[PDB]
Amino acid sequence: GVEIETISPGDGRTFPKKGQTCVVHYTGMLQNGKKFDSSRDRNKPFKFRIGKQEVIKGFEEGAAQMSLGQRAKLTCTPDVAYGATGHPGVIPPNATLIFDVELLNLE
């Protein structure tokens, strides 16, 4: 499950396709928790491609459902990224992840 709450401005048509290296100013967040990962803090806006399962399924499905300029807001389920596993020190198991995703992409 990927719950999208798009803040309106964008274009609504430049969708990420397969093998398109796309750029996201992401900003991570835990439900009832703080940030854990931010491309805005690094100022390195995470040039990633679609179709290789580089990113988690909660972040991959939210990218193709957005367009250029759009500012959505992910609500990632635990079972798609780290629900039983959990990352050591960053993501606990059974965490419902929150992301500030703005698709200002390339290709």
Numbering used by the authors: 1 to 107
Lines quoted from the article behind this entry:
Ca2+, ATP, and caffeine are well-characterized activators of RyR, synergistically activating the channel by inducing a rotation of its activation core and pore opening. We use cryo-EM single-particle snapshots of ryanodine receptor type 1 (RyR1) to exemplify the discovery process facilitated, and the new insights revealed by our approach. Broadly speaking, conformational changes along CC1 involve the cytoplasmic shell, the activation core, and the pore; those along CC2 involve only the cytoplasmic shell.
At the hotspot, the trajectory crosses over to the +ligand landscape with ~0.24% of the probability of association with a ligand, terminating in the region of lowest energy on the +ligand landscape (“FINISH”). The distance change between Calpha of opposite protomers shows a pore dilation of ~4 Å along the least-action path, which is about 2 Å less than the dilation observed between the classes chosen from the clustering analysis and to the previous reports.
